[PDB]
Write a protein that binds this ligand. Structure first.
Ligand SMILES: CCCCCCCCCCCCCCCCCC(=O)OC[C@H](COP(=O)([O-])OCC(O)COP(=O)([O-])OC[C@@H](COC(=O)CCCCCCCCCCCCCCCCC)OC(=O)CCCCCCCCCCCCCCCCC)OC(=O)CCCCCCCCCCCCCCCCC
Ligand SMILES: CCCCCCCCCCCCCCCCCC(=O)OC[C@H](COP(=O)([O-])OCC[N+](C)(C)C)OC(=O)CCCCCCCCCCCCCCCCC
Ligand SMILES: CCCCCCCCCCCCCCCCCC(=O)OC[C@H](COP(=O)(O)OCCN)OC(=O)CCCCCCCCCCCCCCCCC
Ligand SMILES: CCCCCCCCCCCCCCCCCC(=O)OC[C@H](COP(=O)(O)OCCN)OC(=O)CCCCCCCCCCCCCCCCC
Ligand SMILES: CCCCCCCCCCCCCCCCCC(=O)OC[C@H](COP(=O)(O)OCCN)OC(=O)CCCCCCCCCCCCCCCCC
Ligand SMILES: CCCCCCCCCCCCCCCCCC(=O)OC[C@H](COP(=O)(O)OCCN)OC(=O)CCCCCCCCCCCCCCCCC
Ligand SMILES: CCCCCCCCCCCCCCCCCC(=O)O[C@@H](COC(=O)CCCCCCCCCCCCCCC)COP(=O)(O)OC[C@H](O)CO
Lengths: 99, 171, 347, 98, 120, 83, 139, 175, 88, 48
């Protein structure tokens, strides 16, 4: 906050939902709660400019959990190279693939 | 970065309990009340290890004790069970409310024939400890080393040297 | 309006910006911007004249659109980090998105054509509120996220304000139009220094705020909206025109008046940041502002202008409004240069 | 990233272009401004529901209840320029030339 | 810059560390300047309201001078505190980062060859 | 007093819908405060296991937590049973 | 800024054809921006007048870029001065004279020579040196 | 097909925006948004979010947009342009068509669309997570916190709506 | 799917039997805007049923009733300052 | 399937951590026929 009356008065108005690892109704996880716990707990008391450097590995994983860019891009390589093998008959699917 | 370890399909092959939902829910109270320690061991392992592959063995025992529970009742009044779980099946939401007499029929063998007891409301929801063997994981989250916090300020807050030091302002 | 109902509209917007400067959550910041807009519209149309109806429509469409652009800047940052807190932004296009979105709420770059028309339509009393309080809310967010700002992105916005504010100000006739262009020119000064050190951004804001109230409430006392109408006030109220001249010199920036407060430190600050061509252009093009300050100064007090016979009747009656805080606002905007090292208090 | 989000993202952009370009009528511009917050609503719900950010479900309901407040203000201003000028055409709204 | 240094209790116009500074003397040249501004405020206040300038409600002048000096005096305390704070945390970083501020070596002007460009 | 009572009487004479609304809204705001079952409503609200009762590592020295689900130790909702 | 990178990558004077094409590309792109604004803030009568405004503005700007890049490069290696700001000084006036003929006024042509000639030397002036117009916030 | 149903709906969602972004007659523009509003809920519905989706029908489509076209009904000129009318309106419509066709074609062949945001072109379904939700709906239990965690939200959004009621009269009063 | 099938079948039946019937043979604004603001305020307390089962329903009681008195407050100000007595 | 592809470490870790990340359905079902994908993802949502 520009004027952090939040901290001075010691009463919460907005930080409850600011992160998904905070308190949740009936204790349900926010999908990537495990990863962002590591990143935030990496970044406390480190400073903004420092934390972006050292806590980069934690942030990259947390983005990959949240954003899920490369994981399905790799899965794209799974499917694209799959149909580019079945179409010429080079690959046959085992029977657990169907039922 | 690197291979992700996956348990082989060999030890993965485990006797799966081949019963439906109605039979499970009808005897759920007695099943939870009697064979519960292996469930608690596996339940604690899943929340502490946070890694499913670490506690797969305890998962087998969770099923294994389930077969033992179903085996004992099979030797006992299986016919009242067939009556009990069929009427439970005939409920869209599987409500225990409709099935009361057949529920009593099942309950009145196990109390004396099997020596069991229907758990009242609350005991199955009680938060209970479990005496286990597996030690506490060193760091279940697999946390890495923390960055060193910047050193904090120390020393008496001395006056600014030679005033404001902003252009010609002497003080 | 009903005095009690105009009061809450005056200070619902007081609270709307108050939320922005204290909110640590991105959504809540938009909430304060919403009440900022929701309470600004009625005040602009207190008098209900077609100028105000146009001015409200132009103001609403601009601010609403900027607010919407701000939201997707919030969403994209959420989409790429899942963080609702206000910190440095974690994605480039989101950073680029809100800089323009926040700019349009403030209005410095080509997103400034609304500023002259809206203040021209609306009354002078609501003019100061639009030109003074409605700039802290966008600036508070910008000072907050200044770390992630794009240095190229902001600075070109900064000059295009001062060059446009400097150039078009010469041709303006209506005093509100001149005041608006100077506000655009002044807006460029602290926005340029914003990426380097926000302390001077706040320092420029405070001084500029003090100068603008001194300008607006004196004009309210003059009851004049045109240069010729302001020119006549030399005879009825010669003292006001003399004070009109000193604040014009101050808000021009000539030393040792308080207009040399922001520029000098801003010039010094960027010079420490190796940006030296940048200050020279702004300091030199600031003279464009001084020219129509001189033009107003010449017609107000330095040379008396022809008056009308009917205004002998004006001398027969005293003023009514007490124009609260006018004496302290003038002095706090002319002779505060020797108190320059007080800027350390802000940081 | 899933093409449904890029479908939403252009939906903002085409809505953004319509709001900025203008043709004749402020009704259409107000309509274009509503597609803005609309596409924002699905985009907000889509991310928030996908990530199971339970408290963040706050924002979708909060988003449009305040976006609808623009309609409460925007619609009102239109009828006034409609009462005075006649048709609410943007070309009519040019009195503040100076 | 400040802003978020370790220990930043918000909306604190005078943090407790400021009590360890020499308080601004009442005869401070900066402090009396606040008093001078208060007088100028009083003169304008009578001038704007068509009052007999100097001898026109001296009670208002007293209030203006008192407010400016009092509001001034607390300002210098914060002004001196932040200025002292800037140098304090400064003087410790150089110790913690000595290789970041290497000390020069003694070389008198007798050995330094400053080129002499003739002037005509 | 007299005027206030007459004010209510003429309020009921010509405006009976609003006095019904204000009375109901007036009550509906103050019985929940001094209600004796409000704490009961909270008690049964927390006594609804949406989330699993995750077990705790038995390190001893804690007698309150039951070792067995059917064990007498631990909380009970016998109050919920009769009410 | 790949378009701006073209001019910087090609050595001064050498490869005059590449410098000329890159320089007029910069001018043409700049002409597009100003012409687009001109139609926006001040609409013409119809579309045919709109492209007419674009045609004039783009042709002027492209001409300034073409003549500046050509003169700057052709003066560099001819004089064997790959660093002297004068290599851009006559370039600025080359654009300045080019603008003057484009709008057909001697007075504006001389002023454009003086102003562009100074700025072109100044733009070169910073290229040899470390002058930054958008310096990053080091402090 | 059925796997791309969210993609199918998302495609109708985009072309629905071109319907009203082209700025046709205000009634017809509203209709183009009405369908666009309708399909957008289905996109939300396919992701869960029943309550959040249902509002788009109720308080926006049957809500905000009802009074929207209602205002267009008693306002506007006596000659409402039919969608074809001005060649610009149809030019805008076909213009919207070529943007969605080029990206979708680019999306389904190379899957490496980088326009502004780099987005990989896979099916809608490769983004869903996994896990059981127990006995509580995630959406339902989230916005039900309006009165358990939504403290500062309710205080501010309620206050502004009251100011919303007062601002609308003050502008519509006519002084 | 079933939901889509149901709505699709309804449209065709309406479309089919329409075709056989075609080939074989400020006050007005104020009521709109006041409804709009009340309707938006109504959407706030729609999640009330599940919200009534929160574990801190005491805070729910203060604030769920809060919105309802504001509904009354918005109408009360509307009523007293003419408002629902539409222009006539 | 990717023995032939030049550069591919079989079972390459996606996240830098060695902790078990919950495996999203995309890698789970994936290869499965569209009937399995259709019934398992939008199964709860379309069940009525
Ligand atoms: C740093 C150094 C510099 C800054 C120093 C800080 C002070 C800055 C402002 C100085 C004074 C400015 C001023 O008033 O100039 C005269 C100037 C002209 O006065 P005017 O001739 O009476 O015309 C104004 C209205 O048209 C008149 O309309 P009216 O006839 O209806 O009269 C309304 C007036 C007169 O009073 C009433 O009508 C009575 C109302 C009764 C009901 C409410 C009772 C309780 C009120 C107090 C609650 C606390 O009351 C108010 O305006 C009340 C405003 C506060 C509301 C509080 C409650 C919120 C809930 O004032 C305005 O135009 C007011 C603008 C809004 C306030 C100032 C905004 C600009 C400055 C913002 C930045 C400040 C620095 C931030 C850092
Ligand atoms: C005015 C009426 C609304 C504010 C008072 C009544 C609500 C109090 C409340 O819930 O406070 C929540 C909190 C204090 O928390 P609390 O202790 O009441 O409830 C905590 C609930 N859990 C644990 C689930 C998070 O206070 C605030 O949020 C302050 C709100 C603003 C008060 C001033 C408004 C002007
Ligand atoms: C930084 C550089 C300078 C910047 C400022 C420059 C200002 C002037 C620039 C030119 C201005 C335009 C041209 C002239 C405009 C004149 C305006 C005007 O109103 O003039 C006429 C007017 C007539 O005077 P009148 O209002 O009747 O009041 C007389 C005193 N009762 O005159 C007035 O109203 C003026 C009244 C002045 C009153 C002065 C009072 C002085 C009091 C001195 C007190 C000293 C105490 C010493 C204490 C010592 C111990 C501590
Ligand atoms: C038990 C304790 C309480 C007992 C009852 C106390 C209240 C008595 C109310 C008496 C009637 C209402 C007051 C009154 O006199 O209203 C006059 C006026 C009627 O207006 P109108 O019908 O248009 O007639 C005049 C114009 N022709 O009124 C108006 O114009 C304004 C009417 C506003 C109505 C608001 C209704 C809100 C919903 C019902 C109340 C909900 C709870 C509110 C909080 C109550 C707190 C105690
Ligand atoms: C080595 C790298 C560079 C190599 C190439 C050389 C530099 C680029 C080319 C020259 C750019 C600057 C010269 C001006 C170009 C634009 C000219 C233009 O717009 O002309 C049209 C018009 C002038 O005529 P007008 O006043 O309209 O009167 C006739 C009306 N019928 O215009 C106007 O009326 C408005 C005034 C002109 C437009 C605004 C200013 C445009 C130029 C800004 C600086 C551009 C710098 C480019 C290079 C650095 C950045 C890449
Ligand atoms: C950054 C963009 C700033 C845009 C400001 C637009 C308004 C002020 C400039 C203007 O109106 O025209 C400037 C320029 C030249 O105008 P020109 O085409 O010569 O027409 C003259 C007769 N109206 O016309 C323009 O459109 C050029 C504006 C951008 C120049 C760079
Ligand atoms: C009426 C117009 C002007 C009239 C004549 C006035 C005097 C002519 C020259 C004006 C000089 C203005 C800029 C001088 C400010 C201080 C600059 C200085 O001390 O020298 C620096 C010179 O550096 C500069 O680039 C300063 C600016 C040079 C000139 C460009 C801007 C001024 C000209 C345009 C603006 C003024 C003209 C009017 C335009 C309308 C040294 O820094 P450096 O470059 O060595 O930095 C270290 C390292 O190399 C990284 O750079």
């Amino acid at each position: 906050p520009f004027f952090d009356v939040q901290k001075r008065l010691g009463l919460d108005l907005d930080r409850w939902m600011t992160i998904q690892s905070a308190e949740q109704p009936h204790k349900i996880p926010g999908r990537c709660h495990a990863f962002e716990k590591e990143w935030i707990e990496c970044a406390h008391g480190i400073g903004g400019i420092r934390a972006e450097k050292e806590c980069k590995i934690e942030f990259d994983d947390f983005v990959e959990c949240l954003l899920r860019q490369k994981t399905m891009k790799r899965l794209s390589a799974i499917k694209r190279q799959r149909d580019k093998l079945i179409k010429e008959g080079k690959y046959t699917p085992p029977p657990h693939h169907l039922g | 970065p690197g291979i992700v370890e996956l348990p082989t399909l060999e030890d993965l092959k485990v006797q799966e309990v081949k019963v439906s939902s109605s039979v499970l829910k009808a005897a759920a109270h007695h099943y939870g009340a009697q064979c519960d320690k292996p469930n608690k061991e596996f339940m604690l392992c899943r929340w502490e290890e946070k890694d499913p592959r670490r506690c797969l063995e305890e998962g087998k025992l969770v099923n294994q004790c389930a077969l033992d529970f179903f085996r004992q009742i099979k030797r006992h009044c299986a016919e009242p069970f067939t009556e009990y779980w069929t009427c439970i099946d005939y409920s869209g939401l599987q409500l225990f409310r409709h099935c009361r007499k057949q529920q009593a029929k099942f309950d009145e063998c196990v109390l004396d024939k099997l020596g069991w007891v229907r758990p009242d409301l609350g005991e199955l929801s009680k938060v209970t400890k479990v005496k286990t063997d597996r030690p506490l994981p060193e760091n279940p989250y697999h946390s890495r080393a923390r960055p060193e916090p910047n050193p904090e300020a120390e020393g008496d807050l001395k006056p600014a040297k030679h005033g404001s030091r902003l252009f010609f302002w002497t003080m | 309006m009903n005095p009690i109902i105009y009061t809450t509209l005056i200070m619902t917007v007081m609270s709307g910006t108050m939320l922005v400067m204290i909110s640590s959550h991105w959504l809540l910041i938009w909430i304060g911007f919403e009440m900022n807009l929701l309470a600004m519209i009625p005040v602009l149309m207190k008098n209900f004249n077609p100028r105000a109806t146009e001015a409200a429509t132009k103001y609403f469409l601009t601010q609403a659109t900027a607010s919407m652009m701000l939201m997707m800047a919030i969403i994209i940052n959420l989409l790429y980090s899942g963080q609702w807190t206000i910190t440095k932004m974690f994605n480039p296009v989101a950073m680029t998105m809100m800089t323009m979105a926040l700019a349009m709420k403030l209005g410095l770059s080509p997103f400034h054509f609304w500023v002259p028309e809206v203040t021209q339509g609306i009354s002078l009393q609501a003019g100061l509120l639009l030109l003074t309080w409605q700039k802290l809310a966008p600036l508070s967010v910008l000072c907050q996220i200044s770390q992630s700002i794009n240095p190229n992105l902001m600075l070109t916005m900064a000059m295009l304000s001062i060059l446009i504010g400097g150039w078009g100000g010469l041709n303006q006739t209506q005093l509100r139009k001149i005041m608006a262009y100077s506000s655009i020119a002044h807006m460029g000064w602290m926005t340029a220094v914003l990426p380097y050190n926000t302390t001077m951004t706040i320092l420029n804001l405070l001084i500029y705020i003090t100068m603008t109230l001194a300008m607006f409430m004196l004009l309210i006392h003059s009851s004049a909206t045109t240069t010729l109408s302001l020119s006549h006030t030399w005879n009825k109220m010669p003292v006001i025109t003399s004070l009109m001249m000193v604040t014009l010199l101050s808000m021009g920036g000539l030393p040792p008046l308080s207009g040399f407060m922001p520029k000098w430190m801003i010039i010094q600050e960027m010079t420490k940041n190796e940006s030296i061509i940048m200050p020279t252009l702004m300091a030199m093009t600031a003279l464009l502002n001084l020219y129509f300050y001189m033009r107003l100064a010449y017609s107000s007090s330095l040379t008396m202008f022809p008056s009308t016979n009917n205004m002998k009747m004006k001398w027969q009656f005293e003023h009514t409004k007490q124009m609260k805080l006018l004496p302290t606002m003038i002095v706090l905007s002319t002779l505060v240069l020797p108190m320059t090292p007080a800027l350390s208090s802000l940081n | 990233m899933p093409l449904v989000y890029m479908n939403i993202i252009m939906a903002f952009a085409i809505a953004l272009a319509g709001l900025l370009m203008y043709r004749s009528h402020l009704m259409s511009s107000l309509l274009c401004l509503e597609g803005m917050m609309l596409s924002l609503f699905i985009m907000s719900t889509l991310i928030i529901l996908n990530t199971h950010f339970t408290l963040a479900n706050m924002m979708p309901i909060i988003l449009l209840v305040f976006a609808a407040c623009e309609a409460a203000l925007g619609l009102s201003l239109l009828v006034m320029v409609s009462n005075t000028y006649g048709t609410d055409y943007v070309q009519n709204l040019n009195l503040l030339q100076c | 810059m400040m802003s978020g240094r370790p220990g930043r209790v918000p909306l604190q116009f005078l943090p407790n560390e400021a009590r360890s500074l020499p308080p601004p003397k009442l005869t401070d040249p900066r402090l009396v300047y606040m008093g001078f501004l208060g007088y100028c405020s009083g003169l304008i206040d009578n001038a704007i309201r068509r009052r007999p300038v100097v001898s026109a409600g001296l009670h208002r002048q007293l209030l203006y001078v008192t407010s400016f000096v009092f509001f001034g005096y607390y300002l210098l305390k914060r002004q001196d505190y932040m200025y002292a704070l800037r140098d304090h945390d400064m003087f410790a970083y150089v110790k913690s980062h000595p290789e970041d501020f290497p000390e020069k070596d003694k070389k008198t002007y007798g050995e330094i060859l400053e080129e002499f460009h003739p002037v005509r | 007093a007299g005027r206030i009572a007459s004010f209510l009487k003429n309020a009921w004479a010509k405006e009976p819908v609003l006095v019904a609304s204000f009375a109901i809204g007036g009550l509906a705001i103050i019985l929940p405060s001094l209600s004796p079952y409000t704490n009961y409503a909270i008690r049964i609200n927390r006594a609804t296991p949406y989330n699993y009762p995750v077990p705790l590592r038995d390190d001893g020295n804690m007698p309150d937590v039951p070792s067995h689900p059917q064990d007498p130790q631990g909380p009970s909702l016998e109050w919920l049973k009769n009410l | 800024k790949t378009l701006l990178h073209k001019y910087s990558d090609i050595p001064e004077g050498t490869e005059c054809h590449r410098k000329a094409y890159a320089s007029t590309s910069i001018g043409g792109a700049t002409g597009l921006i100003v012409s687009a604004y001109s139609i926006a803030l001040k609409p013409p009568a119809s579309f045919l007048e709109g492209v007419a405004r674009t045609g004039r503005y783009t042709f002027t700007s492209a001409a300034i870029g073409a003549i500046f890049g050509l003169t700057s490069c052709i003066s560099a290696q001819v004089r064997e001065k790959p660093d002297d700001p004068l290599n851009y000084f006559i370039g600025g006036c080359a654009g300045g004279l080019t603008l003057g003929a484009r709008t057909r006024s001697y007075g504006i042509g001389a002023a454009a020579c003086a102003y562009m000639g100074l700025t072109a030397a100044l733009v070169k002036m910073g290229q040899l040196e470390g002058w930054q117009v958008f310096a990053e916030p080091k402090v | 097909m059925t796997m791309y149903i969210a993609f199918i709906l998302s495609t109708i969602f985009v072309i629905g925006f071109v319907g009203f972004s082209s700025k046709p007659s205000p009634i017809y523009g509203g209709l183009g948004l009405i369908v666009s509003g309708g399909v957008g809920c289905g996109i939300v519905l396919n992701f869960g979010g029943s309550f959040l989706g249902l509002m788009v029908f109720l308080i926006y489509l049957g809500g905000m947009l009802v009074v929207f076209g209602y205002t267009t009904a008693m306002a506007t000129e006596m000659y409402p342009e039919v969608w074809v009318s001005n060649k610009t309106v149809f030019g805008a419509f076909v213009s919207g068509l070529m943007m969605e066709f080029c990206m979708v074609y680019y999306a389904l062949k190379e899957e490496e669309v980088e326009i502004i945001f780099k987005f990989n072109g896979l099916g809608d379904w490769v983004i869903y997570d996994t896990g059981d939700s127990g006995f509580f709906s995630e959406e339902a239990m989230g916005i039900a916190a309006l009165y358990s965690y939504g403290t500062w939200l309710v205080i501010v959004t309620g206050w502004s709506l009251l100011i919303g009621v007062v601002v609308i009269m003050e502008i519509t009063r006519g002084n | 799917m079933n939901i889509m099938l149901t709505l699709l079948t309804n449209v065709t039946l309406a479309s089919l039997l329409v075709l056989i019937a075609f080939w074989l043979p400020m006050k007005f604004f104020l009521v709109a805007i006041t409804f709009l603001l009340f309707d938006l305020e109504i959407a706030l307390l729609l999640p009330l049923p599940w919200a009534s089962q929160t574990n801190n329903l005491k805070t729910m009681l203060t604030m769920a009733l809060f919105l309802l008195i504001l509904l009354a407050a918005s109408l009360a100000y509307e009523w007293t300052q003419k408002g629902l007595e539409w222009a006539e | 399937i990717m023995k032939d592809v030049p550069d591919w470490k079989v079972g390459e870790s996606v996240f830098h951590t060695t902790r078990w990340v919950t495996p999203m359905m995309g890698e789970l079902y994936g290869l499965r026929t569209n009937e399995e994908i259709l019934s398992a993802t939008y199964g709860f949502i379309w069940y009525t």
